[PDB]
Amino acid sequence: TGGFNNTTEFKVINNEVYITCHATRMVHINQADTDEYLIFNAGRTTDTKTHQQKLNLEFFVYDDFHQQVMTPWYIVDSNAWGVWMSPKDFQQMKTLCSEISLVTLEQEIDNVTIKTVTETNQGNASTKQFNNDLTASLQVALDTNNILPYTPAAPLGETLGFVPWRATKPTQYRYYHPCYIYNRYPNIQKVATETLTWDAVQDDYLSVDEQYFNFITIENNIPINILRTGDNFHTGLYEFNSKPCKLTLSYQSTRCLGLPPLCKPKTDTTHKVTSKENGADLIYIQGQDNTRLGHFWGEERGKKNAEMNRIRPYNIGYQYPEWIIPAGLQGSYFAGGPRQWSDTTKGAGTHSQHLQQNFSTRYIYDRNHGGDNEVDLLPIHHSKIDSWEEEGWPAASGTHFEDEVIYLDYFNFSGEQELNFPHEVLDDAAQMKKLLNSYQPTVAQDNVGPVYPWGQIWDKKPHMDHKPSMNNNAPFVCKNNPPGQLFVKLTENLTDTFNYDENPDRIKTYGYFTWRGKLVLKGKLSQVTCWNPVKRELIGEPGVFTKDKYHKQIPNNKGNFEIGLQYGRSTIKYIY
Amino acid sequence: TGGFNNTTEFKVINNEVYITCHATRMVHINQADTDEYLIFNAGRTTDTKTHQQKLNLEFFVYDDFHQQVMTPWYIVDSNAWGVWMSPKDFQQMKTLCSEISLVTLEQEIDNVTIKTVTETNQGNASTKQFNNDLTASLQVALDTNNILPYTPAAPLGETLGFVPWRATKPTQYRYYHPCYIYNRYPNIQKVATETLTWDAVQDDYLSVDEQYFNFITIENNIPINILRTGDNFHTGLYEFNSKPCKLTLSYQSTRCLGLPPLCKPKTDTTHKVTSKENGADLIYIQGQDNTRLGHFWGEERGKKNAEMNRIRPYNIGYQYPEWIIPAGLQGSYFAGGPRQWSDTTKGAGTHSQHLQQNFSTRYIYDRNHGGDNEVDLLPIHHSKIDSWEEEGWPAASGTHFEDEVIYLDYFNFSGEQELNFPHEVLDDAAQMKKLLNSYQPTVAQDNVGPVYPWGQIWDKKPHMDHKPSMNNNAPFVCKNNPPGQLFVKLTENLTDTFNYDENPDRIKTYGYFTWRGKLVLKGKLSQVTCWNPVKRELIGEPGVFTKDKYHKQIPNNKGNFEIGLQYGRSTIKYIY
Amino acid sequence: TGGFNNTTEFKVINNEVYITCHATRMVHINQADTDEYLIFNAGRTTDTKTHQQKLNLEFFVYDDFHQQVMTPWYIVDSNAWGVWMSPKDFQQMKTLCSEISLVTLEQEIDNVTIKTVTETNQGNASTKQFNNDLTASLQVALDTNNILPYTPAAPLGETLGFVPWRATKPTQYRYYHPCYIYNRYPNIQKVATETLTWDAVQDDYLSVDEQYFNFITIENNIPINILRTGDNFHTGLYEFNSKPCKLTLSYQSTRCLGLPPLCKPKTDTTHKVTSKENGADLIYIQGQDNTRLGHFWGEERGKKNAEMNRIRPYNIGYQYPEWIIPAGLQGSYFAGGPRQWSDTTKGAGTHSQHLQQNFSTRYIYDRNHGGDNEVDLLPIHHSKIDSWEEEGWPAASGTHFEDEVIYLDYFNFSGEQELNFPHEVLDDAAQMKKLLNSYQPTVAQDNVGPVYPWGQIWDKKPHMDHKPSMNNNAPFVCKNNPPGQLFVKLTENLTDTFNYDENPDRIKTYGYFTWRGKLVLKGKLSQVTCWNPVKRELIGEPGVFTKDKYHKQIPNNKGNFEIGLQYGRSTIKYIY
């Protein structure tokens, strides 16, 4: 119990499943470059001026500019799926459960081991001796009240590593210092056409306001614990309050809600639905084509209605303009959009990449977060980072094809004479692609579920009058405050000569400690009602045909392997 | 207790603060011009026709047209912040509390004093004698069930006065009679270009439908109390059910949510954040520029991502087109928009007024509601009314610069070759300024908080299927029905000769009474976590430099002074 | 609890506020140059003789001469405001409380970590190895009876540092050995005019008397505790007995005590008090100018009295000659004077610096006591020390303009004929500036309150027949003996070769330990009675206009920042 445990156990009692995840890591820690708190601006870029050419797009989307408070502390951040479960474990949960819910979280720290480094230069140096420092200390701070600004580490891909038998690193704690107004290319609309004079304007604009300085330290707000060799620290028992998350996906749109029309099967010939042929024809009124007994949108033009204007209870998904970037106080940002899953739209760039598949997402990760240490084929030697394309497949229900929207003004007509397109329908659809937000209160939207390994498990809600109902990063949002962030630091180890200036003179020191945590999940046995057997794995891009993906799922002779993406919502189910 | 009490007491018990506000006013009342209920149309305006010039904008935005039920009664309306607190008191609450909540409300009426006026003409008249009428009565009606349509008096700037030692007036009770359809400039789109014939169309359009007559009187619905000299009336104890309102503002946008990038401070040179220089530079992967390990929007173009497409949990604020007026049944109206706070956008009208600062607001008020009796420098002599510009400073978090929005269609590219703007980006942004609604379920919006003195404290929610989540006028919205409206009237005092026609022959009569009320507030001690001292006052426009504002905060030799604006949300805090 | 805690909590119970201040520091300690007690004279200076020029003033005011007992021990001195509170915390207390009082003090020492230094010379030396010495000891002595002479360390600006996350140093313990008589320029009045012969006299005079030797050691008087690694030391619970200190300042003088004259406001014209015009005129008796019904000083000259000779209950402040230095046994010293706050006296050096603002004070401090590490703009490179000018603003009530005093001999006259100045009034005022002490039993004087960060919190009263009622350094004076001084020392760590001579042969040794303390304050909720909102910040010299002060309140990219001055008494209130 006082030692390494990384295991999962599945237990079913009341027809509820209980998932207990044990995780343990060896955490290697170094001392920060200073013991000071630091506050600085970083990322302001001056483009290379072309007033005779044109303004630079690359300069526009690559701003990293921000202002930052950098602290001597480090976060131990366990919030990602890859920390708590192996690939088998996540498949197990994915198969057993129809839905899951967070129950409770525990974590502790012990096995503090600190050493000092001595370097004597003999034979042109390159000699290091390592000695235990038995009185050296590790400082631990738990913020249970969430005083400090909340910084989940999964979106930057730096958390505890995903492999239980490798050592891992904490990340240094830092947070934004939103005291400023920043904008890049101000007055974009004051350049006349193209290069009439200069097409580079002012570059950026910046103003900092001392009014807004908010500078928060750990030492003032939180009590700090000091741990030597035999010491240990326990966070306590945290309880999640949050709603359950379904593990099923639906492939269903507005056209599929409710009763289908009544049809008469074709008796003469035989068809399968994959043959893409009519196997039946509709039964209309008195044999009169297009005449149905419904509830429909519009006015009667002669009483011809179809499956298209049949009134539906709800709208599934909504049309939203793709890649709009608004400008906030502190910079311009991608607004994103409703997650959708598209594939195989014939046109545009033809068959190569098709479209972005609506609002597409990439994960980019290193060796310890599930990358094979080699970049996948199609100055450093090659590259050590891997990436994955997360296309939103569980969200397929509400996907919309942005090119295909049609606008009609008068749909009905006072007579049955004819129905023709206006000659502006083509142009009017192009405008409607980029400018149309179809969201309304009849819309039902479905987010992507848990994403493995790299997805964030839980997140904090913002403190605001109008609260958002959805979250891009995480399937679980805490109603109350989230689990407290866990900060760790090496005690300053000083030489005999005290420095009165900024940076202290220190003995070179490092250590490692054991992080151990327990995460408890509650779920419900999956009940699948279909006759046919179910396929729970997204296919079309495995290593089965010449993609060599699944070959890389186990270690090689060097010990390198990579972890594949898995969606928590893998099972088909009817909504409505 | 049976007498004048206007005081506030702050009391802290459980680490909760209790704020008890006592308010008392002398209320001068007159008898209405008739004892009848009146129903009329008012405000229809015929413009001066230019068919040879152009249609008049001034005629368009200045419609006051409405239909109205005017009643003999008067409202005693205490719902504004300036009624219950002094400028010191509101600063006190603003400093002590992190949030506040409404607890309970009591109010009563006594000290009824009624007089009659006799005028004898001697020496060309101008002589008035005043006599007590000891049997005269004041009628009081409390609508506890909210039968009558709800008409908060703060938006028209007429409530009980804000100064405790001045006498004040009630306002006469009236309400809209929505039986009609009204529109001004119908068929605006049927004029061809400019003045091809006549550019003034039909002016307005009006239709009244007897179907919709709803005419409600106090006498049928509510029991009425009669008060003579020694009598007194008590409303009882009302209990608010509503959510708390935070007293903190955030200056934070989407770019500032979560972990900042890891950076390395510059060791050679020294900078302060106000110097607007880089104090550090980012650490990229393998020194390869723009390469980060993230979670990002889009497809990999060669794996260059930045702080701009970094996926964020939420969107803070949203882009909404500014100054759109839709046309409802009973007229066209300004839709408003999400409250924002802008300043210092270089461009457009240059430095003078900059923009509207997004959705700007004005208060316009008289001497008793906190105006100095003189209009501020830059047919009546001068003007006695003052105004204040409420620019939405507590809402700064979600402000957007409408000119700066960018639209990209294909952000990703199948190769790393180049990224260039399309030549339509400039035009396509102009369209997107006026037509784009970026609202979606990931948006978090923050309203302006309590506004002092002129802001409304509480308000009623509409009885509707889809209820609104935000309110422009008031920080507190009652889940159940709001406090009952308090109606007051002088009993008809008739001469000896009874009139059988419309308006009664009355003895000229007036009186005054004492209104007294108690408002209880609950709050939580403010906990500020920053190192630096906090600045709780909005500056940049005080009387400190040559604005002579704070000089006017205390009475002059005439007793005139004016009350300055104060935001309830004055303290900076991190959301998320 | 056995670890780092630096936090403050504000708690309100009985309508009393309780302020608990937690403070913790890492204290770096070195071994003193000797283990001996040392007694020496220091500071005697021989001026460069000009008998042909004139005696040197610089030589006069720069004497540091003293006799001193220097001890091997070190003081841990927490007595300053900057130790116990952050800038936010002090503002909080300043805003919440009308007055404060000291309750109790606790402090302890643990986390003793001692190391030895070994230096091997290889590659021209410059190599240090650091080893734990696990049996080495720290000696701790608490003087609970105040046997040793009391030496508060704030006036020399050396106490524990003000920043909680920086390491800090103790100061070595030393005290005056008052056995001697010292005087500089004896017989200053025996030089005839200027340089009649030699204008440098005898320089100084000195005599030491063995009669008065008082030489006190820690080892004889106090029991000493020995602490190794796991050990800890607790002082116990100390209880303050002292009177409360108000947190309000008054701006009020003798002219403002009591009833003003009755006046009649001007009805024709309008004025504000900042316009500096009469808004009313006085009502005299029977319209007879200057005739009032009073209680006045003097004899009736014809019964014309004014607001100037109106008898007042008290005198607020008193006139005292500024910069007189008396000569005591052990040297000449500045006597100081009643604290006053002056500004804007037109004359003398005109507008540049005006006067000293009466008895002015400077603080001079280093980086760890709140200095930015750079000296403020307007052989070492530049200078690392900062200074602040403390001008006595809370004491403004009793300030006097020393140039403006008038002396009359016969004020009254046996007739109404005329009142004229004597021709000597001008000269007689000049004499009265330098020689006049106006103190008397009707005087009410008000000291400066708490001063942040650098002010001393508490102090000891002298053991004397006539005790002083005021203290220049500290707002709190203990009636009983003050908290005991806490002495700390490294145990002598000796080599194998024992030295029989004066200074011992030691292993080079240093350590650090944790100092932790808890200070409890009691206060009363501030009750402000004014209508207008209150301004609690001294302005006219912030960084708001081009002074860049508040910009420096948060760390830069190097971690340097400075702490601004704050007066405990920031709120205006009427005395009397």
Numbering used by the authors:
A (entry chain G), B (entry chain A), C (entry chain F): 42 to 419, 450 to 647
Sentences from the paper on this structure:
Three-dimensional-image reconstruction of a total of 93,393 individual AMDV capsids resulted in a resolution of 2.37 Å, based on an FSC threshold of 0.143. The reconstructed capsid of AMDV, the first determined structure of the genus Amdoparvovirus, also displayed familiar surface features with channels at the icosahedral five-fold axes, protrusions near the three-fold axes, and depressions at the two-fold axes and surrounding the five-fold axes. Unlike PARV4, the three-fold protrusions were separated and radiated further outwards (the maximum capsid diameter of AMDV being ~300 Å compared to ~270 Å for PARV4). The amino acids, including their side chains in the VP monomers, were generally very well-ordered to the C-terminal tyrosine 647, with the exception of the apexes of the loops at the three-fold protrusion, involving aa 93–94 and 238–239, which showed only weak density at a sigma (σ) threshold of ~1, preventing reliable placement of the amino acid side chains. However, due to the cleavage of the AMDV VPs at D420, no density was observed for aa 420 to 449, but both ends of VR-VII, leucine 419 and proline 450, were visible at the capsid surface. However, in contrast to PARV4, the elongated VR-I and VR-III (15 and 18 aa longer, respectively) are responsible for the three-fold protrusions in AMDV. The region at the three-fold symmetry axis between the protrusions is primarily formed by VR-VIII, while VR-V is not surface-exposed. In fact, AMDV has the longest loop for VR-I, VR-III, VR-IV, and VR-VII among natural Parvovirinae isolates for which structures have been determined.
Aleutian mink disease virus (AMDV), a pathogen in minks, and human parvovirus 4 (PARV4), infecting humans, are parvoviruses belonging to the genera Amdoparvovirus and Tetraparvovirus, respectively. Despite low amino acid sequence identities (10–30%) both viruses share the icosahedral nature of parvovirus capsids, with 60 viral proteins (VPs) assembling the capsid via two-, three-, and five-fold symmetry VP-related interactions, but display major structural variabilities in the surface loops when the capsid structures are superposed onto other parvoviruses. The viral capsids are critical components of the viral infectious life cycle: they protect the viral genome, are the determinants of the tissue type and host that is targeted (tropism), and remain intact while the virus escapes the endo-/lysosomal pathway and trafficks to the nucleus where the genome is released, leading to viral genome replication. The VP monomers of PARV4 and AMDV conserve the β-barrel core motif (βB–βI) with the additional βA strand and the α-helix A (αA) observed in other parvoviruses.
